[PDB]
């Protein structure tokens, strides 16, 4: 084993020069530049709605693009679509497998996708000539549990799995179109760029990668976390994203400078982060925690600006509407709350 | 109230019907007993699951005994890290762990040094002292008993346990194995281990599982009236 050592050394020097270039491009910091911006005042947002009806832990939720309807998944083998203005239940969909841990809502509003420990992504048609919701397709390519899934349009969907890979599917034929294999740990989350041309994934190897949908190659790899990355989300501008890991911190990366910008942590914070989301203009950075709470962060100066404290168990998922009017939180205590 | 339109009233009625269906399903699903089957590949889970019950992902097995319904989930096909999905199974009534007695001399194929029974003991140690399973009882099965009785004639137990000081009798070596597994438990005050030796036993396994489950359910019923 001699040539393998040469390859390892060449990779090591490649990483060294990459880090040298990143240091060359790291003269200033976001904290240094934003030192003279007036802070946003204390944020007091209160519970407007409580959605009841799930009889087990909520694992995922997702907003519709109309900012009124949302879908949530639970371990009791049910998938419920809610009307958030009225708290009326629109549909209740029983699943073949109750070990669900992800759900998604199509931007068109026509489909809902969920998957979990059965290693299958299922698509449901909501708008049929009959009155009921029926399964329209099952995608059975992955060899590990489904951890996240996001629609691109009515015919394409991207999924992440515990077999260290992401894939892109064709709904009508049902076949994998592309495979993304760079990761060396379980992929736990993904986020789509607002124009649906790139996307980022976070894996249990404490790294995040940026993938091109068309070619199917990893352009950039980001590091810095000391533990598993559980959540990921793009900045609305499209040139930055935030990650929340098990080391109790959030971090922000930019694509153009190809490195970390700023860290969000506090001494009193010890638990892991389950979910992360941005506000409509990107000024606020919401994050769900294991300590039963939710923190609101000023994304430009890394100081806490509020707390959402109403859940009796772990905050498992959260999302912000497209119009920026409300925040939804789901928890292991089986309740969904709409904050505003 | 009376500020709602006709279509709004009909949507409210639809929501009420969905709510009653959800409650009915919840009560139907609250009756069943759900178990989590574990253990290594060569442990003997196949005979176990095919004698209570008479491509990848979770496998669910449904059987019945004395008008009590059972559901047993096998997660042997999940080659992912246990820590990211094991918390899905907090709240199971009990955990069934299968071990093969006849592998006290065989070694794992992946590594020569790591002895197979020691691998089973390490998996048991990891599962027992996990923060999601503090108060979950464990039904421990020792399977290849007849092969153990046949193989201890010429294979000393010192091949696996260097400090063993007993004999070639089956019963005393079996007791030593049971003590080795039952002493990996560190809680010792909130959960119990139910060990049972079965090689070709019929309908004894189902009865043993039923008794352990009834004990667990009694101790859980004592946790709603405050008497515990």
């Amino acid at each position, epitope marked *: 084993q001699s040539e393998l050592d040469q390859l390892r050394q060449e990779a090591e020097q490649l990483k060294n020069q990459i880090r040298d270039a990143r240091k060359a491009c790291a003269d200033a910091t976001l904290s240094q530049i934003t030192n003279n911006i007036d802070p946003v005042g204390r944020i007091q947002m209160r519970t407007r709605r409580t959605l009841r009806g799930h009889l087990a832990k909520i694992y995922a939720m997702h907003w519709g693009t109309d900012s009124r309807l949302l879908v949530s998944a639970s371990q009791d083998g049910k998938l419920i679509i809610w009307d958030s203005y009225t708290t009326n239940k629109v549909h209740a969909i029983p699943l073949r497998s109750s070990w669900v841990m992800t759900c998604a809502y199509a931007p068109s509003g026509n489909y809902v996708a969920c998957g979990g420990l059965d290693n299958i992504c299922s698509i449901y048609n909501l708008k049929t000539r*009959e*009155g009921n919701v029926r399964v329209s397709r099952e995608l059975a390519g992955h060899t590990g549990y489904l951890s996240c899934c996001r629609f691109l349009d009515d015919n394409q969907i991207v999924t992440s799995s515990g077999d260290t890979t992401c894939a892109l599917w064709d709904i009508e034929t049902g076949q994998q179109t592309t495979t993304f294999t760079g990761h060396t740990g379980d992929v736990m989350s993904l986020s789509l760029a607002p124009d649906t041309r790139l996307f980022v994934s976070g894996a249990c190897d404490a790294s995040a990668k940026l993938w091109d949908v068309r070619e199917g190659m990893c352009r950039q790899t980001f590091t810095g976390h000391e533990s598993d990355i559980n959540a990921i989300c793009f900045f609305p501008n499209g040139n930055a994203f935030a990650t929340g890991s098990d080391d109790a911190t959030c971090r922000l990366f930019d694509l153009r400078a190809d490195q970390e910008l700023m860290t969000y942590s506090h001494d009193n914070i010890i638990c892991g982060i389950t979910s992360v989301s941005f506000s409509k203009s990107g000024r606020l950075l919401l994050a769900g925690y294991d300590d039963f709470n939710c923190n609101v962060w000023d994304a430009l100066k890394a100081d806490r600006a509020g707390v959402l404290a109403g859940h009796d168990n772990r905050v498992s998922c959260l999302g912000v509407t497209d119009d920026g009017m409300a925040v939804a939180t789901g928890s292991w205590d089986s309740f969904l709350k709409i904050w505003n | 109230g009376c500020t709602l339109s006709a279509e709004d009233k*009909a949507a409210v009625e639809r929501s009420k*019907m969905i709510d009653r269906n959800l409650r009915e399903d919840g009560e139907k699903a609250a009756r069943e007993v759900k178990l989590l089957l574990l253990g290594a590949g060569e442990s003997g889970k196949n005979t176990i699951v095919k004698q209570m019950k008479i491509t990848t992902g979770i496998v669910e097995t449904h059987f019945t005994f004395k008008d009590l319904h059972f559901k047993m989930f096998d997660v042997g096909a999940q080659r992912s890290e246990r820590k990211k999905w094991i918390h899905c199974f907090e709240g199971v009534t009990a955990i069934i762990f299968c071990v093969a007695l006849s592998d006290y001399d065989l070694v794992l194929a992946e590594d020569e040094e790591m002895n197979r029974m020691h691998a089973s003991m390490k998996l048991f140690d990891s599962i027992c002292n996990n923060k999601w399973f503090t108060d979950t009882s464990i039904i421990l099965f020792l399977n290849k008993k007849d092969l153990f009785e046949e193989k201890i004639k010429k294979s000393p137990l010192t091949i696996c346990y260097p400090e063993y000081a007993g004999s070639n009798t089956y019963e005393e070596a079996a007791a030593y194995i049971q003590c080795q597994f039952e002493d990996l438990n560190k809680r010792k005050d909130t959960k119990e281990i139910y060990t049972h030796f079965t090689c070709s036993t019929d309908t004894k396994n189902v009865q043993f599982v039923f008794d352990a489950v009834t004990d667990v359910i009694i101790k859980n019923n004592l946790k709603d009236c405050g008497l515990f």
Partner: single-chain antibody, 233 residues
């Protein structure tokens, strides 16, 4: 596919009872509410009765309340209308209409091919000004309807529906809630209005879509139709 078939009808003498049933096939019957709508010979539509999903809510029109009774047999997928003490003005062709109510749904989306019963020997009023409009293919026509009370609601919904009945066919939904085009309807019809005045626009008129157009309100029970305007070549 989706099908609704009614049975019964025939000749009945005054004061005698008769029973109508409708058989459904091809959709989830128990999730839908159902209506009965009758059409007198050479007249317009007139709502009759309604039963909700789960039979929790029942409404009748004043002209038939106390005489008719409506029920549904969910296991057998059948809707019933038991009529008692029929009157000479009960001669009509009865239709069965399915409707489902949730956010974003389109009620009145399927009308069964009706059955005929002939007998031997305040409420919002909807008005449509014209009654006969000569038309040429390729041009544009503007059917107009007007309501006595505003159909706009506090939540922002305008509860106006448009139906088309071609010669010899059952009525078909075109526009629901005054602006939303129906599923299979070609992108040639448009809905507009504000509060109490409403209009329906047709561009590039063709041969198949000549007939009678009705406006309907769904703000309060009972439901009321307008007098249809006939487009004639």
């Amino acid at each position: 596919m989706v099908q609704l078939v009614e049975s019964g009808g025939g000749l009945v003498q005054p004061g005698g009872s008769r029973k109508l049933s409708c058989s459904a096939s091809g959709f989830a019957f128990s999730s839908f509410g159902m209506h009965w709508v009758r059409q007198a010979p050479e007249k317009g539509l007139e709502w009759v009765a309604y039963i909700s999903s789960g039979s929790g809510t029942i409404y009748y029109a004043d002209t038939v309340k106390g005489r008719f009774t409506i029920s549904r047999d969910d296991p057998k997928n059948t809707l019933f209308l038991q009529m008692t003490s029929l009157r000479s003005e009960d001669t009509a062709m009865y239709y069965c209409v399915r409707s489902i109510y949730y956010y974003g749904s389109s009620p009145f989306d399927f009308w069964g091919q009706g059955t005929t019963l002939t007998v031997s020997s305040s409420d919002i009023v909807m008005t449509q000004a014209t009654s006969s409009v000569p038309v040429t293919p390729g041009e544009s026509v503007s059917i107009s309807c007007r309501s006595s009370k505003s159909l706009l609601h506090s939540n922002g919904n305008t509860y106006l529906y448009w139906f088309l009945q071609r010669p010899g066919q059952s009525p078909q939904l075109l526009i629901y809630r005054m602006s939303n085009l129906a599923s299979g309807v070609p992108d040639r019809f448009s809905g507009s209005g504000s509060g109490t005045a409403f209009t329906l626009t047709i561009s590039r008129l063709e041969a198949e879509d000549v007939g009678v157009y009705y406006c309907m309100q769904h703000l309060e029970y009972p439901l009321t139709f307008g007098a249809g305007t006939k487009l004639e070549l």
